[PDB]
C-alpha cells in the first residue's frame, strides 16, 4: 500500500525504507566517488560518478567524498545525487507518490533544514515531508515516553532529555565527536606500529577495522598496563591485498577518545560528562526518571562493553542513591530509523506533515513553524 | 548567544571562543523597544544585518540575534527559566515595600552593572514599568553614562568618608571572634 518513506540520511550511512516496517529496506554508505584516472578501454563503463555500494566496490580507482560532515550538509550537488540514488535505484519508487520523513541532528543551522525542504519540494516534488530530530525518533523506537537519549551518531553525538513527551529544548547538548573523528584518530595512531593509511580508500579499510576489532575499556589504565605487560590482547586483520596487521594497545585507544576528547586536542568533555550535564540541566524533580532511562543509539555505540563503561562513569558522577540503567538495545544501530517507521505510521500524525500547498504559500521557511 | 548563533551557522564551543562571543555581544547587541515589531522588521528587511570580523579574518553577519540575546533579560522563558524578567522583578520588589514609599521608588529607579549598557534598555525598562505601574505615578529610569563602574565609584565614595572609619573590621577583632564577625559588623 501507499505509505510514507522514512529516510534516515545520517552523516556516514544512509538508511531508507518504507513506513510500517521493522527494518530499513536499503542501507548504504553515503559517499560519492569520482574517478581520478583516464579510461583507455573502449566502451567499458565510462560514467561520471558512482554512489553508494557501487562506489565502495570500485573504491580503488575513485576518490570518495562524504556529502554530510559533522551532521551538516557541505556539498548539495552530492546530497541531491545521494537522494536520487536512494529514490530511483535503492527503493526504486517514484518520489512524488509518498510523503517523506527526514532526520536532522539538533542544534543545526536553520539553512540546512530550509535547503532540505526546498530540495524535497522543488526538485523531487514530494507531496509532503517532515524533518524530525533523531533522538526523539530513537526514543520512540525504544518504546517509552521519558528518558535521555544519547545518540552518538557516526557524524555527531547529541543528548536530548524528554519527560512525559515534553522535550526540554534548553537541556539538549551537541558534541561534534563521532565515528569519523575516531576513524581519523585510528589512522593517526596506527602509524606508531608502522601501518600508513593516507588515501580515502584506505580510510574505508580503517573504518572496517574500527567496526570490527576496536572495543572500549572498562578501566583505561588497567587495560593499558595489561596490554603493555602481556601480548595476549592483540588481534590480526587481513587487508584486501593479503597483508596481515596486528593491533594491540590501539584497540581500546580509538574508542577511548569518546570519553577523553583531550586525545583529539579538544577542550570538550567526554560523552559521559555530556550526558550527566544534560541531565543536570533539567529540573531536579524529574532527574531520577532520567537516571533510570538513559538510552543509547547510533552506530558508534555498538562498541563492546560501552554500556558498562557508561554506567560506571555515570554512577561515579551521579549521587549514590539513584538507580542508573543504561538502556542499550542490541538493535540500536537502526533505532533512529525504527522510530521513524513508527512515527510516520501513526494515525495522530497524519495532520503534522508539511503539505505541498503550505510550502507554496509560505516559502521554505515553514519548516521552522511546522517541524519542532 | 552561543546557542542561537549556531542557527546562522557559526559554532563557538571552546572557552577561548566564549570571549569572542562576549565581545560580539557587547559590541553589536542591543535591546529592542518593541520585540514583535523588531522581529517583523528583521524578517522583512536587511536593515538589522551587522558584520563582525573574527580574529582569524573571517566575517560573520548577525541580524535578528542582535536583539534576541538581550531580550532574554525581559523574557527568561527563552532560557527555559521559570522566573520573571528584570522589569517584573523591579516592579515586584517595589510593590513589596510600604505604600507610602512606592512613589519615590518609582521616581528614582537607578540601573547599574555592566549588563545594562545595552543601547535602548533604559527606554524599554521605562515602557515596561509604566505599563505595569499605575498611571498617576511617574517613572524615571536614572541610567548614568558611567553605570559600568557605579559599584566601584560609590565604593570609593564610601571608603573616603570619615564617619565610615569606625565600621571597619580591624585585625584584633578578627583575632578575637573569627571569620563569623563579618556577619555582625558588615550588614
Amino acid at each position: 500500500d501507499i505509505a510514507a518513506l522514512v529516510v534516515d540520511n545520517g552523516s556516514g550511512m544512509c538508511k531508507a525504507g518504507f513506513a510500517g516496517d521493522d527494518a530499513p529496506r536499503a542501507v548504504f554508505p553515503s559517499i560519492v566517488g569520482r574517478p581520478r584516472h583516464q579510461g583507455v578501454m573502449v566502451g567499458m563503463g565510462q560514467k561520471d560518478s558512482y554512489v553508494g555500494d557501487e562506489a565502495q566496490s570500485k573504491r580503488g580507482i575513485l576518490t570518495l567524498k562524504y556529502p554530510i560532515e559533522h551532521g551538516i550538509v557541505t556539498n548539495w550537488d552530492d546530497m541531491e545525487k545521494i537522494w536520487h540514488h536512494t529514490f530511483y535505484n535503492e527503493l526504486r519508487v517514484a518520489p512524488e507518490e509518498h510523503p517523506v520523513l527526514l532526520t536532522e541532528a539538533p542544534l543545526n543551522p536553520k539553512a540546512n533544514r530550509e535547503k532540505m525542504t526546498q530540495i524535497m519540494f522543488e526538485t523531487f516534488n514530494t507531496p509532503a515531508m517532515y524533518v524530525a530530530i533523531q533522538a526523539v525518533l530513537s526514543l520512540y523506537a525504544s518504546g517509552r515516553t521519558t528518558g535521555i537519549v544519547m545518540d552518538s551518531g557516526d557524524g555527531v553525538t547529541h543528548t536530548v532529555p524528554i519527560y512525559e513527551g515534553y522535550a526540554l529544548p534548553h537541556a539538549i547538548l551537541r558534541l561534534d565527536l563521532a565515528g569519523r573523528d575516531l576513524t581519523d584518530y585510528l589512522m593517526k595512531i596506527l602509524t606508531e606500529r608502522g601501518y600508513s593509511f593516507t588515501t580515502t580508500a584506505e580510510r574505508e579499510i580503517v573504518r572496517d577495522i574500527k567496526e570490527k576489532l576496536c572495543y572500549v575499556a572498562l578501566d583505561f589504565e588497567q587495560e593499558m598496563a595489561t596490554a603493555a605487560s602481556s601480548s595476549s590482547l592483540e588481534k590480526s586483520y587481513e587487508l584486501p591485498d593479503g597483508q596481515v596487521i596486528t593491533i594491540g594497545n590501539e584497540r581500546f585507544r580509538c574508542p577511548e577518545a569518546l570519553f577523553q576528547p583531550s586525545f583529539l586536542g579538544m577542550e570538550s568533555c567526554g560523552i559521559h560528562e555530556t550526558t550527566f550535564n544534560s541531565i543536570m540541566k533539567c529540573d531536579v524533580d524529574i532527574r531520577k526518571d532520567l537516571y533510570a532511562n538513559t538510552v543509547l543509539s547510533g552506530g558508534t555505540t555498538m562498541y563492546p562493553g560501552i554500556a558498562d563503561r557508561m554506567q560506571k562513569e555515570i554512577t561515579a558522577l551521579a549521587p549514590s542513591t539513584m538507580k542508573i540503567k543504561i538502556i542499550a538495545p542490541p538493535e540500536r544501530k537502526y533505532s533512529v530509523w525504527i522510530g521513524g517507521s513508527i512515527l510516520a505510521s501513526l494515525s495522530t500524525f497524519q495532520q503534522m506533515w508539511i503539505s505541498k500547498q503550505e510550502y507554496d504559500e509560505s516559502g521554505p521557511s515553514i519548516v521552522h513553524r511546522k517541524c519542532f | 548567544l552561543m546557542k542561537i548563533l549556531t542557527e546562522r551557522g557559526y559554532s563557538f564551543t571552546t572557552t577561548a571562543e566564549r570571549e569572542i562571543v562576549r565581545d560580539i555581544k557587547e559590541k553589536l547587541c542591543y535591546v529592542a523597544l518593541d520585540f514583535e515589531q523588531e522581529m517583523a522588521t528583521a524578517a522583512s528587511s536587511s536593515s538589522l544585518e551587522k558584520s563582525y570580523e573574527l580574529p582569524d579574518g573571517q566575517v560573520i553577519t548577525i541580524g535578528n540575534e542582535r536583539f534576541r540575546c538581550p531580550e532574554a533579560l525581559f523574557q527568561p522563558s527563552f532560557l527555559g527559566m521559570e522566573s520573571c524578567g528584570i522589569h517584573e522583578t523591579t516592579f515586584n520588589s517595589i510593590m513589596k515595600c510600604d505604600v507610602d514609599i512606592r512613589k519615590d521608588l518609582y521616581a528614582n529607579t537607578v540601573l547599574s552593572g555592566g549588563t545594562t549598557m545595552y543601547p535602548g534598555i533604559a527606554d524599554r525598562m521605562q515602557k515596561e514599568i509604566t505599563a505595569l505601574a499605575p498611571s498617576t505615578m511617574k517613572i524615571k529610569i536614572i541610567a548614568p553614562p558611567e553605570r559600568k563602574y557605579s559599584v566601584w565609584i560609590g565604593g570609593s565614595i564610601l571608603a573616603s568618608l570619615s564617619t565610615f572609619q569606625q565600621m571597619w573590621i580591624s585585625k584584633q577583632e578578627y583575632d578575637e571572634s573569627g571569620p563569623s564577625i563579618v556577619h555582625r559588623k558588615c550588614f
Binding site: 557541505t74 561534534d176 | 551557522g9 563557538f12 571562543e17 560573520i60
Partner: peptide, 7 residues
C-alpha cells in the same frame, strides 16, 4: 560550519 569548525 561557516565560522568555527569546517562543515
Amino acid at each position: 560550519w561557516x565560522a568555527x569548525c569546517p562543515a
